[PDB]
Design a protein around this nucleic acid. Structure first.
Ligand SMILES: COc1ccc2nccc(CC[C@H]3OC[C@H](NC(=O)c4ccc5c(c4)NC(=O)CS5)CO3)c2c1
Ligand SMILES: [Mn+2]
Ligand SMILES: [Mn+2]
Lengths: 670, 672
DNA sequence: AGCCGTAGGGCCCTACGGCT
DNA sequence: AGCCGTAGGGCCCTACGGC
């Protein structure tokens, strides 16, 4: 992968480390070939502070860096064999670039500290506002970043070896809690000291993953990638009524406008939203192969198509009625929603799982009928207890059904945001003839790979670690549903074998509830009541803002209609006024003065087509006006009375419950 | 392997379905009856065993997986009794590439597993059209249409006559191109049980004709293959003009794939990349931002990173496309329209060249200097009977983006007279001193289509292997500032001219361009000479300008007709308004206006659509002026259409303007 | 030879946290 | 252990004709 320089005198030679060949190509084209070598890596490198030594020494990118530098590692590290006197970290100007820099520095510090001490390690400073170096023309890269005469390299300086050791250990080591603490204490919502670099770069990454990747918002239940997909579907009018649209086109659009990351991240998030074994209320309606419970992936995105589900319309409902705040997209050329109106409680309905930095989230899905009944009960009683809420919300309700064992895990999770929930397959024992039996499994636990689970049983039977099983078959089909059959040896006890399978396979699995979501843009562990309270407050705001928007707009339109009504009442004078005017400007002025019109009204009259003078058109103007006056007084009633508003929220939730609410799938056994 | 086997183990009730890959295999696996139906995903095009030797065949992963899965062995050791399935079902995608994969599968079965065919174990599934591949189908649909024994319609493959079948496999799938070419020419039409010979002939012909007429060969008129046409049209439709900002490559590609070009991402993106590369295209058609590859064979950055738009000269390909100059057609699924051909206001086929490997034939057309080409067309426009030697007074020869040298005029002349000929390209190399009484060879230009890094590696190999004497060092000193610079140090006292001549003999420093000018002419492949290529280009331009003139005429007369209606309305506005006001509906008004004022329906409609702001004082004047200018314009257009020589002169003038704006110096030196 | 350029098709390494 | 899901990053097999 090394594209070496022609010179072999270390003192004038430089090596640039880039993320991959997309970046490597702009670099290779821009460089001075004589003195500047280029080593493309392959994205994120091994974190050597967490890895075993042998994994490190067998890692292909680690080996290539060692070979390139020529110095060996650790003990045998020989400075005078360095093939370059500048090693330049040139990752992309994005948060993942920052992460890759923290990773590279960790490796250098732990395995090549003398390289740092001798002042050989540098950080390049490519311009922001590019996704990667492959986005830059070679000449831009050269002039800004690589050319000795204009570039601003940062030389990496080690001051305090003690503070450095503690910094690498804290940020990059296996103990999460110290890293978590560092983030909470530091989170805000020429030479470079290596400790300062590691801390600022690592925090930059940590923060972005926490607030803008891996955790959902409490209000709409979405992570960024999901919000941008759904928003993208909305902007391209890909509603359930219209035909499916090619996935490649959806992804291309989302990536360009909103989500500056790899296609796999976008496509796979969309795919999960279309899987009825993953989403309790699927948000995407997929055409074609969208994967299976056996861990088959979707067909490639060139083959599939998609659109919104009907329930996703309720997530996006009234997004264009000034209900939620828009923000600039990543490059200032587009607007995107900060959050979706989310007219059902999607966070709890669909759940969320997310691996961040310093923390993670794991929120199970719920029955939408129960959830909405929960929100209605809270709406009538702000002081309701978790125990009273559990009269509506019994516990999780997984798309894959199955059993939950007991209530005490659910209770703890709802009270504290954390708890362990034991899940089991739906399995029965039945006769198969000749006095023989079988175990038949028709539902498996949430997030368990069915084919993996079966191979695990096949393995146990082969290693003779389970007695009694004479055959094992997946008889799943579209027509029959999930059906996994385990034949048992004649006169063996099938219940014992079943209990053994629960102990030794994912036929029984735990769900560790860890309910962290973004509240006011900050990560927080929340309980059931707080999730519902944040949801309800969001709904009040959305409906209130929609009411205010509809009021302003209706007033604007009535204002225009009053102008048109005046014009119809005095049409001969209107025509005369315009005919005697030389220009539009003069007409506009005369219309405003003669008939006491606003600029907006005069412009509307000037914009009126002659067809609007026919009988039916005159009547429509008046009908629309009288209808609007009514509408305006309805809107005003709502805004004058907080109880009327709250009731409106309840009636709208009730309508969604009646239309989309469905039966409980997962049985909570006592 | 990825064999997804069924549970039953009685051959006689078991079926195995062969599909193109995992995308298809996932729909198949979700839809199937897992008791009796195994699925084996392949990996796209399989080895053509009629062209490959045994070592290659038996080491091919997909071949091996099929041999293993069927259990019969192959060849002499074939045993029908060990078949693990009594139905082997070919279920490729319902497209031409699917048909190709079917012919490849049958060739394998026929040559290695003939008894399987003879025993009636081989079947062809018939999935429905309108899907890009099986992965586009829901599992229930795939089951009900294709796999369900209660409703499906398998074709059982029958071998009637083994001698005819032998001949068919050899002609269609074998190494002799000419008989395959003869087969296509004899059968092509341009613009249950299943006999295996009939299946092979029909499926292969489908594939071959589709590659010939709709993939691999350029149209003589605009010089474009379908993928490049769809990209450029796509850019135009989304208004990605040179004046607007760069658009992300990923969005262009997804857009083009969705609307026009139902093929892989990499086929589209790489075609776009090439059009943006100034070492590939003599006149680049795409303006790229970011890493778009190098002369060392580095690819472009992944499409997530790059951006693109049209170049200025591409606007000239698309000029007048919205003025009914070219026929639009339905796209592949009937939801869009696309151009059959671009107006192509410069002769793009010869300007940028073309290479393409089809079936039965290929094309290799070198690029040319646009100034020279246009002068050639002009000379032709004045003299239908102009000779090739005369044309060569304007068009000296190819002009490659990479410059360099062409040795002599013999190969050029043969290529322009016949459409075929070998042109010797040579690097630009000089001998120069390097100090200490030593010399070096310096190369600053290389032949078209030569990978610079690879040429350097070939030189290193000659040196390392003692196949060339006198080279002491070898470096690529190329840079953005320097341009291409490859240096070969020569040993003190060695003759550098002799070393250079040896390099020309033994390395890509000198390379042949084999001209083979095949293009689509009236939608069929034709070997054409220079004059024929220019003639068709000139005819296309006459048609474009005539049609544009006709279009403008129609639009002018329509506008004049509306303006006559507006004049009347403004001259009688009070009666107009009163007519409309007493009318209850649109229809009534339209009728009363028409009867009272001798208005057409279009006139009455335009009046009803008139805004009140059009009644201001200077409007009757603006309408009178426009009408007077229009009348003038109309008669100017009528002149053009009544006089062939006027039309042709208008063609000449537009070409000349393009030459003056875009024509550039020759790069490639032709040495005599 | 293997390369030129439109086509068919797919797989594997890395970080991150918490649960087993 | 190693899986879950958003993220960083990339490579190799095939057909086809001509030289
Ligand atoms: C790169 O280095 C390696 C390494 C070896 C590999 N081994 C196996 C498979 C692969 C990649 C194959 C995989 O197939 C699906 C493919 N994309 C599409 O179908 C597609 C279509 C259209 C678009 C699109 C994507 N993306 C957009 O932004 C919108 S337009 C994405 O990549 C390998 C790649
Ligand atoms: Mn990057
Ligand atoms: Mn296919």
């Amino acid at each position: 992968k090394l594209a070496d320089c022609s010179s072999k005198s270390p003192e004038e030679c430089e090596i640039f480390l880039v993320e991959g060949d997309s970046a490597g190509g702009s670099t290779k084209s821009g460089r001075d070939s004589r003195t500047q070598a280029i080593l493309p890596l392959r994205g994120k490198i091994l974190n050597v502070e967490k890895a075993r030594l042998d994994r490190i020494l067998n890692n292909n990118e680690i080996r290539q860096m060692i070979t390139a530098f020529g110095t060996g590692i650790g003990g045998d590290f020989d400075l005078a064999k360095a093939r370059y006197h500048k090693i330049v970290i040139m990752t992309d100007a994005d948060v993942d670039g920052a992460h890759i820099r923290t990773l590279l520095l960790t490796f250098f510090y732990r395995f090549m500290r003398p390289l740092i001490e001798a002042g050989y390690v540098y950080i390049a400073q490519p311009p922001t506002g590019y996704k990667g170096l492959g986005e830059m023309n070679a000449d831009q890269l050269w002039e800004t970043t690589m050319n000795p005469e204009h570039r601003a390299l940062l030389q990496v300086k080690l001051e305090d070896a003690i503070e450095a050791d503690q910094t690498f250990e804290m940020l990059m080591g296996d103990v999460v809690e110290n890293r978590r603490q560092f983030i909470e204490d530091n989170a805000v919502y020429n030479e470079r000291n290596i400790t300062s670099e590691m801390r600022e770069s690592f925090l930059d990454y940590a923060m972005s993953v926490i607030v803008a990747r891996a955790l959902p918002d409490v209000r709409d239940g979405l992570k960024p990638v999901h919000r941008r997909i759904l928003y993208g579907l909305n902007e391209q009018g890909m509603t359930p009524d219209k035909s499916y649209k090619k996935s490649a086109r959806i992804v291309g659009d989302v990536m360009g406008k909103y989500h500056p990351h790899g296609d796999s991240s976008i496509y796979e998030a969309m795919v999960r939203m279309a899987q009825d074994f993953s989403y309790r209320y699927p948000l995407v309606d997929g055409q074609g192969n969208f994967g299976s419970m056996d861990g088959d992936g979707a067909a490639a995105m060139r083959f599939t198509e998609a659109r919104m589900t009907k329930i996703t319309l309720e997530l996006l409902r009234d997004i264009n009625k000034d209900t939620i705040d828009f923000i600039d997209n990543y490059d200032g050329n587009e607007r995107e929603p900060s959050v979706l109106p989310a007219r059902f409680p999607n966070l709890l309905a669909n759940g969320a799982s997310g691996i961040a930095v310093g923390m993670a989230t794991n929120i199970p899905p719920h029955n939408l009928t129960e959830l909405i009944n929960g929100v209605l009960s809270l709406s009538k009683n702000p002081d309701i207890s978790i125990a009273e809420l559990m009269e509506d919300i019994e516990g999780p309700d997984f798309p894959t059904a199955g059993l939950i064992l007991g209530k005490s895990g659910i209770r703890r999770a709802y009270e504290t945001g954390r708890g362990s929930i034991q899940m089991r397959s739906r399995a029965v024992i039945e006769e198969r003839g000749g006095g023989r039996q079988r175990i038949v499994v028709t539902e498996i636990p949430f997030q368990v790979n069915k084919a993996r689970m079966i191979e695990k049983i096949a393995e146990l039977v082969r290693d003779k670690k389970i007695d009694g099983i004479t055959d094992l078959r997946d008889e799943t089909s579209l027509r029959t549903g999930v059906r996994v059959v385990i034949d048992v040896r004649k006169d063996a006890n099938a219940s014992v074998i079943l209990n053994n399978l629960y102990k030794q396979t994912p036929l029984q699995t735990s769900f560790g509830v860890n309910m962290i979501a973004l509240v006011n843009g900050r990560p927080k562990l929340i309980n059931l009541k707080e999730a519902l309270v944040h949801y309800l407050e969001h709904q009040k705001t959305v409906v209130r803002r929609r009411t205010q928007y509809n009021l302003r707009k209706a007033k604007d339109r009535a204002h225009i209609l009053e102008g048109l009504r005046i014009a119809l009442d005095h049409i001969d004078e209107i025509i005369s006024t315009i005919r005697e005017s030389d220009t539009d400007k003069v007409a506009m002025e005369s219309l405003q003065q003669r008939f006491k019109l606003s600029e907006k009204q005069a412009q509307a009259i000037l914009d009126m087509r002659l067809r609007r003078l026919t009988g039916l058109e005159r009547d429509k103007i008046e009908a629309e006006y009288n209808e609007l006056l009514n509408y305006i007084s309805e809107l005003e009633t709502i805004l004058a009375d907080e109880e009327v508003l709250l009731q409106l929220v309840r009636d709208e939730l009730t309508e969604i419950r009646d239309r989309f609410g469905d039966d409980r799938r997962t049985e909570i056994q006592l």
